[PDB]
């Protein structure tokens, strides 16, 4: 329901989404960089009466003619009263469609190796596994958690 684009003044309503232990808030230079540079990959979803169901950030930063023009996924979250609806597969489908439109060459992803929910979701969508970045997710005393770089190859094009 209501797959629109993440306007600023939705950084003040996305608090059923970012009060998760697995979802970060990134600061305001991060959100405004991803709103200025790549506003295509920044879909939010809204329920009948507000209640932001869940956003998806993302970028496409690489270099063509080295076969590395890839489209990232740099946040994905669904609010915990709106999960198991098929919303997260819808947002990943829209990011794969957008990053297939502007050329293509895989879609990457960074998921920590603690949650079998997200990893066993990306295995089922089609994402294979690439290298495991060691001590990637830093803190915020808590230990550093490794990250499965995940890559899904789609519709090879320069």
């Amino acid at each position: 329901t209501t797959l629109r684009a993440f306007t600023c003044d939705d950084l003040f309503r996305f608090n059923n989404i970012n009060l998760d232990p697995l979802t970060e808030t990134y600061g305001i230079p991060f959100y405004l960089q991803y709103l200025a540079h790549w506003p295509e990959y920044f879909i939010v979803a809204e329920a009948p009466g507000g209640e932001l169901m869940g956003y998806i950030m993302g970028k496409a930063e690489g270099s063509v003619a080295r076969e590395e023009w890839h489209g990232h996924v740099t946040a994905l979250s669904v609010a915990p009263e709106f999960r198991r609806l098929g919303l997260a597969a819808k947002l990943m489908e829209l990011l794969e469609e957008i990053s297939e439109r502007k050329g293509g060459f895989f879609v990457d992803l960074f998921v920590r190796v603690s949650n079998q929910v997200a990893v066993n979701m990306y295995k089922q969508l089609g994402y294979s596994v690439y290298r495991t970045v060691i001590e990637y997710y830093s803190a915020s005393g808590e230990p550093d958690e490794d990250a499965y770089d995940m890559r899904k190859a789609l519709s090879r094009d320069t």
């Binding site: 600061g27 991060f30 740099t74 946040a75 994905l76 920590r112 990637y136 997710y137 830093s138």
Partner: peptide
């Protein structure tokens, strides 16, 4: 989810 900085 990426790192914060």
């Amino acid at each position: 989810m990426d790192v914060f900085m």
